[PDB]
Design a protein around this nucleic acid. Structure first.
Lengths: 49, 299, 1255
RNA sequence: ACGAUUAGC
RNA sequence: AUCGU
């Protein structure tokens, strides 16, 4: 979702319906990518509480 | 150009005074928000701008050349206003102006006249001068000068794709033929040469001549004009008003042509005339509708 | 019970109870003729209704305001209606009318519009003008019915007095509730009772020829006259289609709510998608079974080659994946106070979960329950509402992307960043490929295309003469002769000698107006352009024809459901391959000079430049026009005739159009109007509309689409489909096909995103696509779900007829033709066959008598017109179907079917003759037929049903100069005249009158003169002559039939074995046809539907593709085939083809080809005047004509059915002779074998030849 | 002096 | 769209 938001921001910066340069249509498989979020604590648990 | 054309006279007529002419801003000036004020409040609904000056900065770069993407985006907001807030009022005003006389109308864009169903001859005219610098030198045109530049660009792109003829054609048509008439019959007798055409309401209409065109020509030309049948040209005349303040007692009339219109070759090619004229009845009481016809009176 | 007492024998005759004879028919017709309206309403009151027939009636229909507060006078002294709900509230108000009535003489209780108000409006009063405009508009609204409504009501009463009807196939009575459950009829009775009140008269209004009279009463309003017709339509549909009571009650509720609202027409226009959107758009939310056709249409695409391969069961995963249509439906139901009806419909729809016959019938009933009336409004308001809208172009073509003007055209440089480049390229290539392609220079082609628009119909000639006299050029006038002076033929005669330079002024003339109403849709205004204005737009329509013929996948289909692309809808509606309905809103005002015309004129202009230098086109000389193309220098650039055409058309399109409006419903409402909308009624309109639609969809699918999308799946979908494979466009509407992949059907979300993209894309150049994604298919007003057609009953009203002006209605034979058309429309829509036949016979009897003396049409004439008959001569009732061929073939079919019983019946009662006849034997068929009036009806049915106002006396030498003018106009190129003169020379040399009337180009002026004289009002003497002709035909006695019928009766056939089924019996192909409707179901299952478009199949038969207007291609081909069969030298055919205008070499080659080749049955059939009836054209008749009709008897050669090797064309005639019998009988279509020919094959051929040597 | 005026397919 | 008024 964060790469998609970056793509939308680039589209707005370019002022077109679709940005020529995209971060989501890449043909490379990148399923193992992890981005930092507030789901995990430092100890390794989840911030359910 | 209006000021110059106002002070033009050759024979005992006025060619184009400060009348019979509708200004381009006059179509949209008579509204509670004017069209200029309406398009001033367009920065709302556009991201990154909060004021008219901010909009002008955002749409115009340092070069003062329009940025194609931003101006194209802004036209998508400008056009709905020009197609919903202006067009009906423009159509009503143009129809009303056409009803109460034959007038020359000035407009900013071709689509402005086309979308209002203007009933008249359409002429596209351009001047040699650069208009943008003229806008940049002019001041106090109800807002920022950069706003005037952007608004002019918007009207330009709003217009359709058609080749505009030069202003010289219309200006020559308006001015030049009369000078030849001054050369020819300026020495001649005024009453002998003078003639006019207008609607003829019958005398037996209890409560009249309403001129339509005026022709100044040599005596032979008008004598040729006389026997031409000014028939099968009917109109409905509604003439009720208080006196138009004037040199002679004269009330204003409203005539609408139902049949055909006057062919210029039916009039002449050897005789000049006037392009625009207002409608007013030559003489009180109330008014009504009378189906009148044309007539040609002279001395 | 008075109906029974006064009609006893007639019901038993037409209900299959007793025999159907002529005396009973004539007595019933006389009783229909003498039956007062008050007696009709008394018999109506005698009906013992029940509950379930009663629906509450609001009290506010009667109490309505006046009309003054609804109209006003604006500037320019025009009358128009002020709007209260948006800009569409311009229809007829529902206000009262009582205070505008003055009693008519000779009857006190009726009145019309007062002449005092008429005069006070004529001399200039405002309120009087408003009142008379309202009165005339209400008159026009009330005058939208074919005939007085009481006749239809009484015919329904008589027809339904018979009760339930036995079914020969189903072997049981039909369970349909009687008239006691008819809700609309009860509502009609209640409304009439409440309006009538204490007054003895009961008719709310009486409908005369010109004008109607209103029964004055305080409860009378203006919404009654459409409401009554609506209720009668609903009642007739319920009785003749087996509509369930609940849906009809909902429809009546909707109609009453519409009447109680501010404007009936406005409310019914606002609510016109209640039933189709709640029922058709929401079924099959959860499927468990059913069968759908497994269609597959071949890779040759422009030919529409469709193949049918069984039926496959419906899986559960083929549910309704389209987005739900709940929110907007509920909101619309809440807005207009129709929440209960919408809720009922939505709850009822969800109970159908299997694609059986019942769900399709429920859909048909729901679509039939909508209100079908002809909406009407003042012309000055439809003009002001339709011709003032302009397109909204958000990204116009940049100014820098053009060049200097080539006269009045600027070529668009191919370096543009706008989307118009691809449109310009497509049109440029189309124009070039036209100009290089050589048939556009043969003089016959130019003559045909110049005579396309020359038609005996109005073309605004007054404006033409005014504009052309404005330059002091005088045109001849013709006085004293009875031709119409307001038709385009008159203009063509007036514009004969004049060159193009003088007539070029008339191109910029002001077009006159036109108007016509339509069912559940706003009326359309039409502007007919004068003859030179049609002429000047020839390259546009021609290159549009080229585009629509080669570049795209499209069709130019015909008017009726039979001549339409039904297969494509069946294929596009199948569950594996869902489809999208694309419609363009207001396409007339869409294209203007800003974008579309600006690109198109330049594309055409430089398309033809480097292909045709000089060589002037039809009647337009080449000319010279400068250009400022490159930098500063300007050339002279000589142009061809077509480019002068383009220059004139370009000035016309750039300036716009002037539209004179001089109506009659509002006095003092004449004016002019300048509009920018593309003209409707021009030659080029539909072709260019379809071409532009296809080109814009293609460029979207190619370039614009991928440039504005992000998701991968939608891109994969968009790269997969192209307009050449799956897109079919005709004019305004269109249809796109999305085929199923291996994993089922394409995901709905991708389609929704793509539709959003289409909506965004269309607004860039001023288009608003009306896109519906509902899982069904719509095209040319045809509705399909899961490969099953659904006829929209309400779109074809039974009592409705559109009338724009205030002209009086045509005489009685015209209403006879209209009743026959109503019966045929009922046939195509699939009603309950027994009940529909009975009701059609009831109307037949009702409208069969007219006084002047009295004139009557014997039943047999109506049978000859194509209406099937129930039970005669003591045979079995309900034995003949309505697939009966109309005409002579039809008589033969039923007579040969029932002959051995006819002879027995004749002999059994006083008809015996010692002479033996080969057809009927020893029965005096002559005296019997003369007494039964069968000969009289058969011969009278052939007489014309319009007054013979053609041929009226004309002073001489005036008609002569007229005909000379048309002759000069038709043939301006000398070489074509030389061809015609040659053809006549070798025709005199060789033809020698073998055929009496060979078509030729010199007789075109005569036919044009007759047609132009035909479109005129007929004096009383013409009608008197017509009635005298009918009386003389009735009184006369005829010895025998026509030659063709006697020749047909010599052929005997035999029916051994039924065909094996061609369609699965569990597959619903169309609504209305099911086991409850035995005859159409069995006929379609045994024969099979036509899976090929009829237009191309019929086109491939003709020898010559097209001919000049005023001549018939069928006539030319019939003459050619007669000259083959009657022996004639080849030279005769060459002379005939030369007389048609074909070139000598091509005529010789075609004659040589024709001499020896054989042709399919259709063309050979035409030789004796036989064509496939319009009823059969919905079935697959070709396979039956080819295979399942065998000329060889089932037991070998009989030495009597020996067709000679000469006159081998007899096989086609025999094929139809057998097929008529095979199709007339009810039940399964049966294989039919030839049995015997009495006189022998050579004798029968000699009879046909001696008939051919006639006419 | 007013009046029974219209498409294309 | 003038003889219908």
């Amino acid at each position: 979702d964060e790469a998609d938001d970056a793509t939308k921001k680039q589209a707005k910066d370019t002022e077109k319906a679709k940005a020529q340069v995209t971060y989501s249509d890449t043909g490379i498989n990148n399923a193992n990518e992890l981005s930092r979020s507030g789901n995990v604590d430092n100890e390794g648990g989840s911030n359910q509480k | 150009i209006m000021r110059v054309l106002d002070s033009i006279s050759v024979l005992g007529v006025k060619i184009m005074p400060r009348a019979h002419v509708v200004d381009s801003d006059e179509v949209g000036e008579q509204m509670e928000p004017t069209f200029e004020h309406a398009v001033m409040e367009i920065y709302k609904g556009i991201a990154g701008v909060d004021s008219l000056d901010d909009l002008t900065k955002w749409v115009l770069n340092s070069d003062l050349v329009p940025h194609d993407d931003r101006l194209g985006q802004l036209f998508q907001a400008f056009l709905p206003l020009a197609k919903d807030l202006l067009a009906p009022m423009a159509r009503q005003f143009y129809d009303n102006s056409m009803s109460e006389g034959r007038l020359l109308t000035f407009a900013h864009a071709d689509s402005e006249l086309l979308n209002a169903n203007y009933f008249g001859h359409l002429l596209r005219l351009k001047i040699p001068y650069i208009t943008e610098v003229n806008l940049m030198i002019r001041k106090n045109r109800e807002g920022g000068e950069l706003f005037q530049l952007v608004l002019s660009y918007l009207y330009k792109m709003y217009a359709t794709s058609a080749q505009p003829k030069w202003f010289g054609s219309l200006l020559r048509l308006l001015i030049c033929p009369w000078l030849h008439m001054e050369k020819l019959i300026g020495e001649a007798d005024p009453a002998s040469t003078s003639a006019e055409i207008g609607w003829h309401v019958p005398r037996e209409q209890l409560m009249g001549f309403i001129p339509y065109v005026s022709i100044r020509a040599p005596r032979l030309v008008i004598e040729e004009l006389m026997e031409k049948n000014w028939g099968q040209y009917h109109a409905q005349v509604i003439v009720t008003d208080q006196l138009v303040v004037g040199e002679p007692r004269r009330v204003s009339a409203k005539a609408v042509i139902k049949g055909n219109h006057l062919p210029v070759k039916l009039i002449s090619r050897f005789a000049c005339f006037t392009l625009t004229s207002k409608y007013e009845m030559r003489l009180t009481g109330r008014g009504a509708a009378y189906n009148a016809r044309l007539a040609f009176r002279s001395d | 019970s008075m109906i029974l007492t006064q009609f006893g024998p007639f019901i038993e005759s037409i209900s299959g109870i007793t025999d159907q004879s002529n005396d009973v028919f004539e007595n019933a017709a006389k009783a229909f003729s003498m039956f007062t309206r008050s007696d009709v309403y008394k018999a109506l009151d005698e009906i013992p209704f029940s509950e379930d027939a009663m629906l509450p009636i609001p009290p506010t229909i009667y109490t309505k305001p006046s009309h003054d507060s609804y109209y006003y006078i604006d500037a320019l002294n025009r009358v128009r209606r002020k709007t209260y709900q948006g800009p569409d509230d311009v229809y007829v108000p529902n206000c009262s009318i009582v205070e505008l009535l003055e009693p008519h003489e000779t009857l006190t209780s009726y009145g019309r519009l007062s002449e005092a108000i008429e005069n006070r409006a004529k001399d200039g009063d405002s309120q009087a003008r408003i009142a008379t405009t309202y009165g005339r508009i209400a008159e026009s609204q009330a005058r939208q019915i074919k005939a007085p409504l009481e006749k239809f009501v009484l015919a329904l009463l008589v027809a339904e007095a018979g009760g339930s009807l036995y079914d020969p196939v189903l072997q049981k009575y039909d369970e349909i509730p009687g008239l006691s459950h008819n809700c609309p009829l009860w509502c009609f009775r209640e409304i009439c009772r409440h309006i009538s009140g204490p007054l003895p008269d009961r008719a709310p209004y009486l409908y005369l020829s010109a004008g109607v009279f209103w029964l004055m009463s305080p409860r009378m309003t203006s919404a009654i006259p459409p409401l009554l017709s609506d209720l009668v339509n609903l009642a007739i549909l319920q009785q003749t289609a087996g509509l369930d009571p609940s849906l009809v009650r909902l429809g009546v509720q909707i109609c009453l709510h519409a009447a109680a609202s501010s404007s009936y027409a406005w409310f019914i226009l606002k609510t016109k998608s209640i039933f189709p959107q709640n029922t058709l758009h929401s079924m099959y939310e959860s499927l468990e079974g059913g069968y759908c056709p497994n269609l597959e249409w071949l890779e040759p695409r422009s030919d529409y080659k469709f193949m049918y391969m069984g039926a496959m069961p419906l899986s559960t995963k083929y549910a309704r994946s389209a987005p739900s249509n709940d929110k907007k439906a509920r909101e619309l139901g809440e807005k207009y106070g129709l929440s209960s009806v919408v809720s009922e419909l939505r709850r009822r729809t969800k109970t159908y979960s299997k694609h059986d016959f019942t769900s399709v019938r429920y859909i048909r009933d729901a679509m039939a329950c909508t209100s079908g009336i002809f909406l009407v409004r003042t012309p000055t308001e439809t003009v002001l509402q339709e011709y003032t809208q302009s397109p909204e172009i958000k990204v116009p073509i940049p100014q820098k992307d053009w060049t200097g003007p080539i006269g009045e055209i600027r070529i668009l440089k191919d370096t543009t960043s706008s989307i118009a480049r691809y449109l310009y390229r497509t049109w440029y290539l189309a124009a070039a490929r036209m100009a290089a392609q050589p048939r556009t220079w043969d003089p016959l082609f130019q003559a045909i295309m110049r005579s396309q628009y020359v038609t005996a119909r109005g073309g605004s000639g007054a404006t033409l003469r005014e504009s052309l006299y404005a330059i002091n050029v005088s045109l001849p006038d013709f006085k004293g002769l009875p031709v119409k002076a307001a038709t385009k033929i008159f203009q063509a005669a007036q514009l004969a000698n004049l060159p193009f330079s003088h007539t070029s002024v008339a191109i910029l003339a002001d077009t006159s107006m036109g108007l016509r109403n339509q069912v559940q849709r706003r009326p359309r205004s039409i502007m007919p352009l004068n003859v030179p204005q049609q002429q000047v737009s020839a390259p546009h329509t021609l290159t549009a024809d080229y585009i629509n013929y080669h570049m795209n996948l499209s069709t130019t289909s015909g008017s009726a459901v039979i001549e339409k692309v039904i297969p494509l809808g069946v294929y596009a509606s199948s569950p594996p391959n869902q489809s999208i309905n694309i419609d363009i809103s207001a396409c007339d005002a869409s294209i203007t000079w800003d974008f579309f015309l600006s690109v198109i004129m330049a594309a055409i202009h430089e398309g033809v430049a480097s292909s045709s230098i000089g060589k002037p086109f039809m009647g337009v000389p080449a000319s010279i026009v400068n250009d400022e193309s490159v930098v500063g220098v300007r050339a002279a650039r000589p142009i061809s005739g077509m480019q002068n055409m383009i220059q004139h058309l370009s000035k016309l399109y750039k300036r716009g159009f002037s539209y004179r409006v001089n109506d009659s419903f509002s006095p003092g409402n004449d004016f002019t109007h300048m509009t920018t909308t593309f003209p409707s009624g021009s030659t080029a309109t539909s072709t260019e509309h379809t071409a532009n639609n296809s080109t814009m969809m293609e460029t979207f699918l190619t370039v614009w689409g991928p440039e504005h999308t992000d998701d991968p799946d939608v891109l994969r979908l968009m790269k997969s489909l192209t307009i050449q494979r799956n897109y079919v466009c005709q004019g305004d509407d269109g249809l796109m096909i999305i085929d199923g992949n291996t994993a089922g059907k394409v995901n709905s979300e991708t389609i929704q995103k793509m539709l959003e993209l289409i909506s965004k894309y269309g607004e860039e150049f001023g288009w608003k696509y009306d896109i519906a994604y509902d899982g069904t298919a719509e095209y040319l007003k045809l509705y399909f779900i899961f490969g099953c057609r659904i006829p929209n009953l309400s779109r074809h009203p039974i009592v409705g007829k559109e009338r724009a002006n205030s002209s009086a209605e045509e005489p009685w034979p015209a209403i006879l033709d209209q009743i026959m058309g109503i019966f045929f429309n009922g046939v195509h829509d699939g009603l309950q066959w027994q009940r529909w036949i009975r009701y059609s016979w009831a109307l037949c009897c009702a409208f069969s008598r007219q006084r002047t003396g009295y004139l009557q049409y014997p039943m047999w004439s109506f049978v000859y017109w194509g209406l099937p008959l129930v039970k005669v001569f003591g045979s079995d009732p309900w034995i003949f179907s309505w697939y009966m061929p109309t005409g002579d073939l039809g008589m033969y079919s039923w007579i040969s079917l029932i002959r051995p019983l006819m002879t027995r019946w004749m002999v059994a009662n006083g008809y015996v003759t010692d002479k033996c006849s080969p057809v009927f034997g020893n029965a005096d068929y002559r005296k019997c037929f003369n007494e039964l009036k069968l000969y009289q009806g058969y011969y009278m049915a052939q007489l014309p049903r319009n007054p013979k106002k053609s041929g009226r006396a004309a002073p001489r030498e005036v008609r002569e100069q007229f005909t000379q003018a048309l002759s000069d106009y038709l043939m301006q190129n000398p070489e074509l005249k030389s061809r015609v003169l040659r053809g006549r020379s070798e025709w005199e040399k060789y033809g020698a009158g073998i055929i009496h009337n060979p078509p030729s180009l010199f007789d075109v002026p005569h036919k044009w003169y007759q047609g132009a004289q035909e479109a005129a009002t007929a004096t009383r003497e013409e009608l008197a002559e017509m009635d005298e002709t009918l009386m003389r035909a009735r009184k006369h006695s005829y010895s025998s039939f026509s030659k063709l019928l006697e020749a047909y009766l010599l052929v005997k056939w035999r029916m051994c074995e039924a065909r094996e089924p061609s369609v699965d019996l569990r597959l619903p192909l169309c609504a209305g046809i099911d086991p409850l409707n035995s005859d159409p179901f069995l006929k379609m299952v045994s024969v099979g539907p036509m899976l090929q478009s009829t237009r191309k199949y019929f086109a491939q038969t003709l020898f010559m593709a097209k001919t000049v207007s005023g001549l018939d291609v069928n006539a030319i081909d019939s003459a050619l085939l007669r000259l083959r069969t009657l022996g004639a030298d080849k030279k005769a055919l060459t002379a005939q083809l030369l007389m048609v205008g074909l070139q000598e070499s091509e005529a010789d080659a075609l004659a040589g080809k024709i001499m020896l080749q054989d042709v399919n049955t259709v063309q050979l059939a035409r030789v004796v005047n036989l064509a496939v009836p319009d009823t059969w054209m919905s079935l697959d008749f070709d396979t039956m004509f080819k295979h399942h009709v065998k000329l060889l008897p089932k037991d070998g050669r009989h030495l009597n059915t020996d067709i000679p090797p000469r006159m081998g064309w007899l096989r086609a005639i025999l094929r139809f002779l057998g097929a008529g019998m095979a199709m007339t009988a009810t039940g399964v279509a049966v294989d039919i074998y030839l049995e015997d020919i009495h006189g022998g094959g050579r004798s029968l051929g000699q009879r046909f030849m001696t008939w051919m040597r006639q006419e």
